Amino acid sequence: AWMRTLHTTASNWLHLIPQTLSHLKRTVENIKDPLFRFFEREVKMGAKLLQDVRQDLADVVQVCEGKKKQTNYLRTLINELVKGILPRSWSHYTVPAGMTVIQWVSDFSERIKQLQNISLAAA
């Protein structure tokens, strides 16, 4: 019932959320560049956050499928997602108060898309 709806919306988000952020910000000749340094650290943080979010959402989907055992952290995460309140761990950038998980993931997807564009331009 509810758990299946959670699975469906998590699968929809995983389809919506772009895949692994290409951490192609790597040039020893561009280290001295300030813009390169800033974009490198931003892409690194975005890629780590993307990996964490993707793995957590895949874990949520798989435990919705029933073929795994959830732990205390997963219980906290599912209790956060059921009420629509943003997961506390996923918060690595400033978020307006009251933003729903759907709004947060849409914003995160847009940020990941623009970071993909930045990495493609840098490469």
PDB file of N, CA, C and O in Angstrom, residues 2 10 17 25 41 43-44 51-52 60 78 86 88 97 110 113 123:
ATOM      1  N   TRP A   2       1.077   1.827   1.190  1.00  0.00           N
ATOM      2  CA  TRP A   2       1.912   3.019   1.310  1.00  0.00           C
ATOM      3  C   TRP A   2       3.341   2.738   0.865  1.00  0.00           C
ATOM      4  O   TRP A   2       3.973   3.572   0.206  1.00  0.00           O
ATOM      5  N   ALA A  10      10.059   6.805  -5.348  1.00  0.00           N
ATOM      6  CA  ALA A  10      11.516   6.748  -5.289  1.00  0.00           C
ATOM      7  C   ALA A  10      12.107   6.334  -6.630  1.00  0.00           C
ATOM      8  O   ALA A  10      13.143   6.862  -7.047  1.00  0.00           O
ATOM      9  N   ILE A  17      16.527  11.957 -11.140  1.00  0.00           N
ATOM     10  CA  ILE A  17      17.846  12.409 -10.683  1.00  0.00           C
ATOM     11  C   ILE A  17      18.911  11.935 -11.664  1.00  0.00           C
ATOM     12  O   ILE A  17      18.958  10.734 -11.996  1.00  0.00           O
ATOM     13  N   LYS A  25      36.958  17.234 -13.272  1.00  0.00           N
ATOM     14  CA  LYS A  25      37.775  18.385 -12.919  1.00  0.00           C
ATOM     15  C   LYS A  25      39.133  17.894 -12.443  1.00  0.00           C
ATOM     16  O   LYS A  25      39.322  17.629 -11.252  1.00  0.00           O
ATOM     17  N   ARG A  41      36.261  22.076  -6.463  1.00  0.00           N
ATOM     18  CA  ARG A  41      35.724  21.731  -5.149  1.00  0.00           C
ATOM     19  C   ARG A  41      34.205  21.596  -5.196  1.00  0.00           C
ATOM     20  O   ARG A  41      33.635  20.702  -4.555  1.00  0.00           O
ATOM     21  N   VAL A  43      32.406  20.632  -7.823  1.00  0.00           N
ATOM     22  CA  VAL A  43      32.088  19.386  -8.513  1.00  0.00           C
ATOM     23  C   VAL A  43      32.381  18.193  -7.617  1.00  0.00           C
ATOM     24  O   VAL A  43      31.635  17.211  -7.612  1.00  0.00           O
ATOM     25  N   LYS A  44      33.459  18.259  -6.834  1.00  0.00           N
ATOM     26  CA  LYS A  44      33.767  17.173  -5.910  1.00  0.00           C
ATOM     27  C   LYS A  44      32.668  17.013  -4.864  1.00  0.00           C
ATOM     28  O   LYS A  44      32.190  15.900  -4.610  1.00  0.00           O
ATOM     29  N   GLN A  51      26.490  10.765  -5.149  1.00  0.00           N
ATOM     30  CA  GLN A  51      26.696   9.351  -4.857  1.00  0.00           C
ATOM     31  C   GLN A  51      25.930   8.940  -3.609  1.00  0.00           C
ATOM     32  O   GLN A  51      25.260   7.901  -3.593  1.00  0.00           O
ATOM     33  N   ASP A  52      26.002   9.757  -2.555  1.00  0.00           N
ATOM     34  CA  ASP A  52      25.284   9.433  -1.327  1.00  0.00           C
ATOM     35  C   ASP A  52      23.778   9.386  -1.564  1.00  0.00           C
ATOM     36  O   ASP A  52      23.098   8.451  -1.125  1.00  0.00           O
ATOM     37  N   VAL A  60      16.637   2.589  -0.536  1.00  0.00           N
ATOM     38  CA  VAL A  60      15.222   2.742  -0.205  1.00  0.00           C
ATOM     39  C   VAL A  60      14.361   1.932  -1.164  1.00  0.00           C
ATOM     40  O   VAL A  60      13.434   1.227  -0.750  1.00  0.00           O
ATOM     41  N   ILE A  78      13.662   6.646   6.160  1.00  0.00           N
ATOM     42  CA  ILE A  78      12.312   6.378   5.668  1.00  0.00           C
ATOM     43  C   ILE A  78      11.289   7.182   6.463  1.00  0.00           C
ATOM     44  O   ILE A  78      10.300   7.674   5.908  1.00  0.00           O
ATOM     45  N   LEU A  86      12.668  17.015   4.510  1.00  0.00           N
ATOM     46  CA  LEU A  86      13.936  16.763   3.845  1.00  0.00           C
ATOM     47  C   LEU A  86      14.868  15.968   4.758  1.00  0.00           C
ATOM     48  O   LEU A  86      14.977  16.287   5.951  1.00  0.00           O
ATOM     49  N   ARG A  88      17.978  15.004   6.829  1.00  0.00           N
ATOM     50  CA  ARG A  88      18.971  15.895   7.418  1.00  0.00           C
ATOM     51  C   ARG A  88      20.358  15.625   6.849  1.00  0.00           C
ATOM     52  O   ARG A  88      21.145  16.555   6.637  1.00  0.00           O
ATOM     53  N   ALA A  97      13.670  27.106   4.419  1.00  0.00           N
ATOM     54  CA  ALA A  97      12.862  26.373   5.382  1.00  0.00           C
ATOM     55  C   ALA A  97      11.520  25.988   4.771  1.00  0.00           C
ATOM     56  O   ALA A  97      10.900  26.771   4.047  1.00  0.00           O
ATOM     57  N   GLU A 110      18.532  19.970 -10.812  1.00  0.00           N
ATOM     58  CA  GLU A 110      18.950  21.118 -11.614  1.00  0.00           C
ATOM     59  C   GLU A 110      20.412  21.471 -11.352  1.00  0.00           C
ATOM     60  O   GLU A 110      21.174  21.759 -12.289  1.00  0.00           O
ATOM     61  N   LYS A 113      22.579  18.955 -13.058  1.00  0.00           N
ATOM     62  CA  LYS A 113      22.618  19.188 -14.500  1.00  0.00           C
ATOM     63  C   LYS A 113      23.578  20.319 -14.850  1.00  0.00           C
ATOM     64  O   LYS A 113      24.384  20.204 -15.786  1.00  0.00           O
ATOM     65  N   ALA A 123      36.137  19.889 -19.529  1.00  0.00           N
ATOM     66  CA  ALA A 123      36.795  18.794 -20.240  1.00  0.00           C
ATOM     67  C   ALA A 123      36.942  19.066 -21.732  1.00  0.00           C
ATOM     68  O   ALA A 123      37.325  18.176 -22.495  1.00  0.00           O
TER      69      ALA A 123
END
